[PDB]
């Protein structure tokens, strides 16, 4: 036995389909470790989760553990170069990231198949000897502030922190987690506090081995991985740090029976109901939280939400167990509010308790629990193959809370039925123990309090005893009934035999004037489920802003008529998605194949026999109206990407255009739109999964025949199947389209360097070049110069036309343009001075990314589907383009750069979108030409050509 290892649990409870082998072990210093050996993985990955979170932050230094996690990436004493950790992963087709939750600081990364040892050596040094360079502390603090400035105006984070402010002020639950520049450098130097030493005071007192968990995934054997982890992580300093618990509740009686009227940024109307409950993570064997969450958050027949639809008060409801920390949890029941549902809040909550007592009346239902036990064991047995990076991060988090032998069955399987624990939680859900919160702009001007961190104006008022006592006498409502037997639970998991004529890529098996079917039976994953994607085409889905609205409202009403029916199938892992596109409708049905056609049939039947409820039309059209105006509050970097898509697309309707034409959407016009939309269709579909070729053709005939016999569908002409083109830019042209952002104080920018049409030469020219500047653009533009948090540089493929794009969200003026051009010159000298060894280190890096095997069924279907929507159908694009990628020379890329992308390039096609804030109008930058300011989109597209479309194979 190795004395650096305390115990080794070799038998980890595994899914019988999981061909990966595991081994859990606990080192002598306390680090819980799980080892995953997948001899076929193309990306090795590891992750570490420290059990110290932002709750342990010093009170005077808000958000220190989060600041710590940013500073660990910037160097250790054995790897002192500031980007060595980031660059080594970039050169070997890997990525890395981390986050700071309340009780965890979780680091993770993926790396190349064969380079696990090199990266894990650099990764382990974070916990042994980090430099905390003061030149890096003075800069990366600005990247943390930009992380806050991007979230300051986000309503989800504003409510997240407003919950913190209402509790006991000196409970650590009220602590600020993110932390801006104020809490990190402006305040501590103002009071004489060495922040860098406080990082060490925190790192050398909390980052102990007994609070760490490591997961490592790679092709190396379990024994080679065991020796690989003990050599790097057994020398982590153990310090016997006590496990931080918070047994005292953050909400005492002073904070109960309280209502909070909040003003949101967006025009949203939500109602949050919170019930404080004890810590339930010790009863995970029974999990009484998901039992009550399953019934309250139920949306089926006689459910709680389905009745709130009948009265036009609510549109969505989520309810159940909400994680808090060790020692306390919450039980939420959050709902959307209609225009009338905001005015009848009390009856909503009364109807909530009218449901809760129906659960108290009929007592616990053991048949519901055992159904959950059945559904989860099946969903776990046929669990999809996870991605290595997210898998290790997730397991490293739950590795603290469960024995090694049950880390895989922890979140999934339930074992004991405990009606005593259900009664315990159900007993603590009374109005005497309630907290209400109303989010609505109808309250603006009537708020008397201001939260300090986000500026969210709200008002606190106590619930009248009249209302509480009325809620205490919650009588049993007739319209509430327990959910009936979920009959969508799949019974047949038979893996259909693989055909001898089966194909490795989707095969066009049917070509009619109506439909074109793409089919491949699953020959890789062998799971009893299938993906059914349909792309219905109709020009009247995007002719004018009126029709595109009705294309959405039709499909949005269509899911409202199916929520009762579909929720049972959703619980059986049989989900469906339906949404309007610019070309028509998009239906995607994924999940178990057993009862799949039954769901697909009712979607198509009600698609052709739909009858609008006048009550639910006006409700959704109201919500759709607020959804179009709530885009002004989106972050500027999303306004940058939005405007560029409207510029470089043949035709596109703005949010404002759809909103102005929504006043013309009357119910009679929408009723006459459906027969006109469903008049002529063309069905391009992909049926990939556990189905035969005869069934796939039979499934397609179900969609054809159902639309013919109920919508009299007529085959569409092929000359009408015109997909939109991309605007072809002029040589040496620089266009700038700028517009203001009404909410945010930062600037957004997207610099598009349009290269040429997609081709195996042009595609791998850019993907290799985008790979080379992938790391340097992130380092020079964010870590070194600290422009902002959002720094992205990659390829942009759209409508068969591609190019190189830079998306930056900063507090600096679109100076951003100068820097991006100045950064390109830094790369041009870098490639000339780039060694041949370091050059193909990038080529083999890109080849790993492209040839990365899709690990789950839904991932392969989307990869095929991408070729189908793009009308290219290059299904072997991976193997084809990598063969050409390896043939490129460094001299080939420089000729590509100097001809297409350089500042003096003869074929530079540069367009910039500048999303300005509300009051803004030593590496030296090159001389930039005076650009032509785009004034009108329609006049702009009128004077330019349109690129062709990629010819299919």
């Amino acid at each position, epitope marked *: 036995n190795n004395p650096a290892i305390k115990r080794i649990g070799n038998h980890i409870t595994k899914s019988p389909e999981d061909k990966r082998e595991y081994r859990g072990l606990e080192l002598a210093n306390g680090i819980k470790v799980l080892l995953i050996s997948d001899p076929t993985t193309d990306k090795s990955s590891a992750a570490l989760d420290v059990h110290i979170g932002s709750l342990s932050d010093p009170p005077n230094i808000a958000g220190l553990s989060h600041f710590l996690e940013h500073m660990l990436f910037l160097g250790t004493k054995k790897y002192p170069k500031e980007n060595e950790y980031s660059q080594f992963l970039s050169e070997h087709a890997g990525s890395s990231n981390a986050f700071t939750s309340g009780e965890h600081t979780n680091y993770y990364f993926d790396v190349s198949h064969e380079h696990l040892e090199g990266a894990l050596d650099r990764f382990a040094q974070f916990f042994l000897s980090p430099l905390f360079d003061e030149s890096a502390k003075d800069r990366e603090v600005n990247a943390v502030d930009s992380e806050h400035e991007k979230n300051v105006m986000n309503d989800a984070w504003r409510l997240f922190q407003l919950e913190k402010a209402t509790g006991n002020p000196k409970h650590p639950f009220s602590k600020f987690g993110t932390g801006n520049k104020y809490t990190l450098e402006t305040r501590p130097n103002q009071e004489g506090i060495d922040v860098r030493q406080e990082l060490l005071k925190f790192h050398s007192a909390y980052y102990s081995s007994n609070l760490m968990a490591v997961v490592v995934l790679g092709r190396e054997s379990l024994d080679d991985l065991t020796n690989l982890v003990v050599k790097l992580f057994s020398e982590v300093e153990n310090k016997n740090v006590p496990l931080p618990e918070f047994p005292e509740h953050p909400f005492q009686e002073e904070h109960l029976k309280q*209502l909070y*009227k909040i003003v949101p940024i967006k025009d949203i109307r939500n109602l949050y109901v919170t019930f404080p409950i004890p810590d339930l993570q010790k009863y995970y064997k029974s999990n009484p939280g998901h039992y009550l969450g399953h019934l309250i958050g139920h949306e089926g027949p006689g459910s709680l939400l389905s009745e709130l639809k009948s009265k036009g008060w609510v549109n969505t409801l989520v309810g159940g167990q909400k994680e808090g920390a060790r020692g306390f949890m919450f039980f939420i029941i959050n709902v959307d509010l209609t225009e009338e549902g*905001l*005015l*009848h*809040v*009390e*009856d909503i909550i*009364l109807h909530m308790f009218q449901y809760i007592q129906k659960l108290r009346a009929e007592g616990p239902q053991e048949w519901v629990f055992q159904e959950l036990k059945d559904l989860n064991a099946v969903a776990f047995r046929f669990k999809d193959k996870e991605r290595p990076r997210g898998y290790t991060s997730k397991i490293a988090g739950i590795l603290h809370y469960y024995p090694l032998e049950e880390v895989l069955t922890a979140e999934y399987l339930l074992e004991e039925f405990r009606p005593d624990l259900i009664e315990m939680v159900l007993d603590k859900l009374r109005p005497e123990n309630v907290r209400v919160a*109303i989010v609505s702009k109808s309250f603006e001007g*009537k708020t008397d309090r201001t939260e300090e961190w986000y500026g969210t104006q709200y008002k606190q*008022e*106590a*619930i*009248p*005893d*009249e*209302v509480i*006592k*009325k809620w205490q*006498n919650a*009588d049993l409502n007739g319209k509430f009934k327990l959910p009936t037997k979920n009959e969508f639970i799949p019974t047949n998991f038979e893996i259909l035999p693989l055909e001898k004529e089966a194909t490795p890529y989707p095969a066009l098996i049917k070509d009619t004037a109506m439909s074109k079917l793409w089919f491949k039976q699953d020959d890789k994953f062998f799971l009893p489920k299938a993906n059914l994607n349909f792309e219905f085409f109709s020009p009247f889905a995007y002719v004018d802003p009126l029709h595109s609205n009705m294309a959405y409202l039709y499909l949005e009403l269509l899911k409202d008529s199916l929520n009762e029916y579909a929720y049972a199938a959703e619980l059986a892992g049989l989900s469906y998605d339906l949404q309007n596109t610019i070309y028509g409708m998009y239906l995607s049905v994924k999940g178990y194949n057993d009862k799949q056609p039954i769901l697909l049939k009712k979607i198509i039947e009600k698609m052709a026999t739909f009858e609008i409820d006048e009550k639910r039309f006006e409700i959704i059209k109201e919500a759709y109206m607020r959804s179009l105006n709530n885009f002004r509050a989106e972050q500027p970097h999303q306004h940058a990407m939005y405007y560029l898509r409207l510029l470089m697309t043949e035709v596109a309707w703005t949010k404002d255009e759809l909103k102005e034409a929504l006043d013309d959407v009357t119910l009679p016009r929408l009723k006459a739109f459906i027969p006109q939309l469903l008049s002529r269709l063309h069905i391009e579909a992909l049926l990939h999964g556990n189905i035969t070729k005869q069934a796939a053709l039979g499934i397609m005939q179900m969609v054809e025949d159902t639309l013919i016999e109920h919508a009299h569908t007529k085959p569409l002409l092929p000359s009408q199947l015109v997909r939109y083109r991309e605007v072809q830019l002029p040589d040496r042209g620089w266009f700038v389209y700028q517009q203001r952002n009404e909410v945010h104080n930062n600037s957004g920018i997207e610099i598009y360097y349009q290269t040429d049409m997609q081709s195996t030469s042009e595609n791998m020219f850019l993907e290799l070049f985008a790979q080379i500047i992938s790391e340097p653009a992130f380092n020079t533009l964010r870590t070194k110069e600290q422009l902002g948090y959002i720094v992205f540089s990659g390829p942009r493929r759209a409508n068969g036309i591609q190019g190189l794009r830079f998306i930056i969200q900063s507090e600096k003026p679109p100076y951003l343009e100068s820097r991006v051009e100045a950064f390109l010159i830094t790369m041009e000298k870098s490639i000339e001075d780039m060694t041949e060894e370091a050059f193909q280190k990038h080529i083999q890096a890109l080849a790993i990314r492209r040839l990365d095997k899709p690990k789950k069924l839904s991932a392969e279907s989307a990869k095929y589907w991408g070729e189908i929507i793009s009308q290219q159908y290059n299904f072997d694009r991976d193997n084809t383009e990598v063969a050409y990628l390896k043939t490129l020379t460094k001299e080939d890329i420089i000729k590509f750069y100097k001809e297409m992308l350089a500042v003096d390039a003869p074929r530079r096609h540069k367009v910039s979108v500048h999303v300005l804030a509300r009051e803004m109008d030593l590496s030296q930058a090159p001389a930039l030409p005076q650009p032509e300011v785009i004034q009108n989109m329609t006049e702009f597209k009128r004077g330019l050509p349109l690129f062709p479309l990629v010819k299919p194979h």
Partner: antibody, heavy 119, light 108 residues
Framework: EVQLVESGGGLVQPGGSLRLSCAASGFNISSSSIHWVRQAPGKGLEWVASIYSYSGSTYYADSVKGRFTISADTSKNTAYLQMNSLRAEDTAVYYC????????????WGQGTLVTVFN | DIQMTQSPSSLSASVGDRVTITCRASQSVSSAVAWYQQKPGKAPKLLIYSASSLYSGVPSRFSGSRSGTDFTLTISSLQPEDFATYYCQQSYFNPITFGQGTKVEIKR
């Protein structure tokens, strides 16, 4: 000193508009529910509407839903009821009352103003 | 939504007589009913809340009861300050409804 004072009552023509005000004194209105109760001369009691001054603003009766708009201002500690599309049916004495700390209350009533709808 | 009926439309009793007035509901209403006294001209006065609880400052001769959908206000001994119009209420987050009224007329 817990009293309620109605105001704003007088003469209106059909289709006109009135806005009544119930001035609360001796307690904050966000503490309990305010109700409006009218009485036509010769008839019994009739429930007009109610306002929950903290939130969950409006609960109206089927006989006035759509014609009446009830509101309140916590800073003024006062509740209002604007009356639109007035019929000859709505001529009545409009009482305003505080609800008790129970399920069935209305313990404190007021003077009650007169709304006459006529030429 | 839910409506309230009356037991008598009017009655005639003497001083010392016992008065029992009944309202009856349409649907099941668990307590949540109040009795009011309105002397002609001025505002009504609350008598019984929660269909049984005697309001503070109300003479003890008043008592409210509940039997399913029936609510009975019993005055043990009528008196010169006890003759007026008597209404009952309904309290639920539905529209509050009243009774037609009971006009207890004394007789000397």
């Amino acid at each position: 000193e817990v009293q309620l004072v109605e105001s704003g009552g007088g003469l209106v023509q059909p289709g006109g508009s009135l806005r009544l005000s119930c001035a609360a004194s001796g307690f904050n209105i966000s503490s309990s529910s305010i109700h409006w109760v009218r009485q036509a001369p010769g008839k019994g009691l009739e429930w007009v509407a109610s306002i929950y001054s903290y939130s969950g603003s409006t609960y109206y009766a089927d006989s006035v839903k759509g014609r009446f708009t009830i509101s309140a201002d916590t800073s003024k500690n006062t509740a209002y009821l604007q009356m639109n599309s007035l019929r000859a049916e709505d001529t009545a004495v409009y009482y305003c009352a505080r609800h008790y700390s129970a399920v069935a209350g209305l313990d404190y009533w007021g003077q009650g103003t007169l709304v006459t709808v006529f030429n | 939504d839910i409506q309230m009926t009356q037991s008598p439309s009017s009655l005639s009793a003497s001083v010392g007589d016992r008065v029992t007035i009944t309202c009856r509901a349409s649907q099941s209403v668990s307590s949540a009913v109040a009795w009011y006294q309105q002397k002609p001209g001025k505002a009504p006065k609350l008598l019984i809340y929660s269909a049984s609880s005697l309001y503070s400052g109300v003479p003890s001769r008043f008592s409210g009861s509940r039997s399913g959908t029936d609510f009975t206000l019993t005055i043990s001994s009528l008196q010169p300050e006890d003759f007026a119009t008597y209404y009952c209420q309904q309290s639920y987050f539905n529209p509050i409804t009243f009774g037609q009224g009971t006009k207890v007329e004394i007789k000397r």
